[PDB]
């Protein structure tokens, strides 16, 4: 039951660094990698006392992979897995998809096939990127298309980071995200959702971090990833692997852009006094001020929830919490969906890290939500795409690199079809 992890771009290969920092301690593996079969789904034991991750980090520029190559985990990965190019896509979907992409994707796919052949019980792929960039968007599309044409019938989990309405660090990122969604709609299988602004807000409020940097963001995204993947590693009461996810949560092949939430995230100064039993952690998982995507889901109707509980959690109290949720008046599911919950329970409480920020909490909850409200991000992206594109701004870079007006128009109209489909399914 193995799943392999691929990281593309700055955001991807930093979130991966956070994830491996988490997993090494979660399984007891020392930095270089030893122990002084839960690991079998992420590491592959080779030789006497040596475990290598089932990942591949890659990027078109080497200044971001060099610190991974020479850092505190220089002894962890296979020295051939930390792929790197020479010139980055330079915030250009076109550049990273048409003239720099066609060099490194072949090597990446060769190593991917090598890892797949080393695997024995392949469950799926899980990739990391932020579609607002160039080497994220273009290279992720170019790599996902080949991965799908190779494997096709195996799950893919893109943990993508869209841009935020007002917290943004680029001008061509609307073009990048629009041109990436046209392919992430069709090639991936489940698109887990993150935003930088929503995580900033949750850091500001729940963790009372006045000035949060990327370290905390990655450190609390890795925990969500571990929570939704811990079913394979640790045997619990109710077991859910990747297959049940996209069979309980995806009603139509075009609605797989699902929000993610987690509760609780309470600092060690409030965890002593806090009451973190199951009912209240569920009620705090379903609150809008704790969802990692900058959206107001109360504007829309839910379609499918997936609640992964970890720790000292029994089944009937989660059933009762679900009862309270479905009796509440402010949140409502679509008419055709009487039951809309998938509850799984695991016996391993979340793991903390030395030098970290969270607390050694007894129980926790991760949540994956498929709801109609997610179309607001797409509508906003369409609007702030067309605002620039009405004057042909920044199109000269893409055109000179090798794109054309037709691709832009077709991506925009595909996003329009997606918005109309969301409005139809919200009826």
């Amino acid at each position: 039951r193995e799943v392999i992890s691929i990281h593309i771009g700055q955001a991807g290969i930093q979130v991966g660094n956070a994830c491996w920092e988490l997993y090494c301690l979660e399984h007891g593996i020392q930095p270089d990698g030893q122990m002084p079969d839960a690991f079998n789904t992420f590491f592959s034991e080779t030789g006497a006392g040596k475990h290598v991750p089932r990942c591949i980090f890659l990027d078109l520029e080497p200044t971001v992979v060099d610190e991974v190559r020479t850092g505190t985990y220089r002894q962890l990965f296979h020295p051939e897995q930390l792929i790197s190019g020479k010139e980055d896509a330079a915030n250009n979907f076109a550049r990273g998809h048409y003239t720099i992409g066609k060099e490194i994707v072949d090597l990446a796919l060769d190593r991917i096939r090598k890892l797949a052949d080393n695997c024995t019980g392949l469950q799926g792929f899980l990739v990391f990127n932020a579609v607002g960039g160039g080497t994220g968007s273009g290279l992720g599309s170019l790599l996902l298309e080949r991965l799908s044409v190779d494997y096709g019938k195996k799950s893919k989990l893109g943990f993508t980071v869209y841009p935020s309405p007002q917290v943004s660090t680029a001008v061509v990122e609307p073009y990048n995200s629009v041109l990436s969604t046209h392919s992430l709609l069709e090639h991936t299988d489940v698109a887990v959702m993150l935003d930088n602004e929503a995580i900033y807000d949750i850091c500001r409020r729940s963790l009372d971090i006045e000035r949060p940097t990327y370290t905390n963001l990655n450190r609390l995204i890795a925990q969500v990833i571990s929570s939704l993947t811990a079913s394979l590693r640790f045997d619990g009461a109710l077991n859910v692997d990747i297959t049940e996810f996209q069979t309980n949560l995806v009603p139509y092949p075009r609605i797989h852009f699902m929000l993610s939430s987690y509760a609780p995230i309470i600092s060690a100064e409030k965890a002593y006094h806090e009451q973190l039993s199951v009912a209240e952690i569920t009620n705090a998982a379903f609150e809008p001020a704790s969802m990692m995507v900058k959206c107001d889901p109360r504007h829309g109707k839910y379609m499918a929830c997936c609640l992964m509980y970890r720790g000292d959690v029994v089944p009937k109290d989660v059933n009762a919490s679900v009862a309270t949720i479905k009796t509440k008046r402010t949140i409502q599911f679509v008419d055709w969906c009487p039951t809309g919950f998938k509850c799984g329970i695991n016996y391993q409480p979340p793991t903390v890290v030395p030098g970290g920020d969270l607390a050694k909490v007894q129980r926790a909850v991760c949540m994956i939500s498929n709801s109609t409200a997610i179309g607001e991000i797409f509508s906003r992206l369409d609007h702030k795409f067309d605002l620039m594109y009405a004057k042909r701004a920044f199109v000269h870079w893409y055109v000179g690199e090798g794109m054309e007006e037709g691709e832009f128009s077709e991506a925009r109209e595909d996003l329009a079809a997606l918005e109309k489909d969301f409005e139809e399914v919200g009826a």
């Binding site: 048409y98 003239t99 066609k102 298309e145 044409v149 090798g402």
Partner: peptide, 22 residues
């Protein structure tokens, strides 16, 4: 124009491969 021709040929060949894939 020569480099544009090269890029157009590459893109159209990959497009044909994609169409055959679909």
């Amino acid at each position: 124009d020569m480099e544009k021709a090269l890029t157009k040929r590459e893109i159209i060949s990959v497009k044909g491969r994609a169409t055959a894939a679909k």
